[PDB]
Amino acid sequence: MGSITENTSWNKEFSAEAVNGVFVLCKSSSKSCATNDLARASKEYLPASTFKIPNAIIGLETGVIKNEHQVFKWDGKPRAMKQWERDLTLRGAIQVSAVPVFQQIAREVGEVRMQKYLKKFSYGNQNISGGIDKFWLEGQLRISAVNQVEFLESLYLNKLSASKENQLIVKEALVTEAAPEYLVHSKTGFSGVGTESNPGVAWWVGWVEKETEVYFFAFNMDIDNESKLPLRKSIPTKIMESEGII
Template sequence: MRYFIGAVLAAFLLNACSPNNVQVNNELGKYFDSASVKGSFALFNNGTGDFAIYNLNRYKDSAYSPAGTYNIVHSLIALETGVVSDENMTIQLDSAVSMETAFKQSVDPYFQEVAKRIGKDTLQFWLDSLAYGNHQIGKSIDSFWLNNTLKLTADEQLGLVKKLFFNQLPFQKRTHEIVKKMMLQESNANYQLSYKDGLTPLENGKQLAWVAGWIEENKHPYFFVLNLEGPSNSQMTGISKDLLRKILANQGFFEGKR
């Protein structure tokens, strides 16, 4: 299982930024402006290979702490190494919390305990193998994905969730499938919406919010990543999810017609 996929991931990401398949969509800026935030959004149509991107420079060039979105990778590593047996495994915090609950609700203490059980050397091996962001753990094994030590771009986020969907990361199929199951947020006759969100303070005092995942309509996946920056006193988690729905609706989703 120990093989390096950084070159493959880099090749995908480079292709993501080629001029032939990227459409810059400045119209989406109205949603960011109305919420008094700045950020970027990208939508990848897997069927055509086309990207619709708002704020291309921020999307491909600016790296940020992954916050709760790191729990995608954290869960993959925990399952693959056997530190967590499955999504139902509980850890006793104030009460018994399962990995699935911790994943969906971004319960940091659960994943901080998991990080300690995995160990720094094993975590570093997997971050290097995945070419995940800047690969940095630093001195705090239980907070490096929250304290601006580990950073990655929105482009790298999208590359990761695309490879997760297609079971193309260096993990067993079972590991992929469990994490994909935990990412599913909504499922009905028209669409299935899967994502992981995250929220963390930035070094400039503002808040950063992420939402990364995919939406499926008529068995066709579309991958997205939303990155938002706003005031420290704003409800960024709610704002990010609201913006995601508005942008996806603008792009014609939720009616089962894509």
């Protein structure tokens, strides 16, 4: 990751909504990043569903996910969101953030291989304590916005310690907007509303390919009410629009 400079002017998009959070934006060609809050940019938080990115790669690497067209069948038993109550492709399970699919992937990966790949990926504090099926949701794993950008830059370049094939598979699964000269890869996360004095976290991470430029981004915010969740996309979108990226 390049140098990073604090630009406190981006705080305008945050104060307008009374949000405590951070945005990190890096422009690949210039090896330079900017953030509204240097200290928070390095602060580590639960990854929540952003962990679907490494978990998918690891599932493929270990053979738990058999290939890019594996279907994850629904057993017909209640799941916490109706959007999850159906058979899913890998891309579908990522896009609708289907926790139970990824919990079973994690169980089958198992703790040894999971620890091994988080080391290889330099993924946050690499702490998988708290149960193999939940450490990224309610356990001790933490990652910063800076580290998310670093991880995504490696993924973009196919430089993670995993096959290029499996990195490409997960990349296509992360596409969220496609136009002739504009392509977005992204992933949301949301840990919940937290507890008294201890808010939850909401994330949006990804990158934008516009013409021949690439912009890597990571956003997180404190959240204690689900009604604020749209801000996790609207604040970074407004910043990126102000930068002319869109």
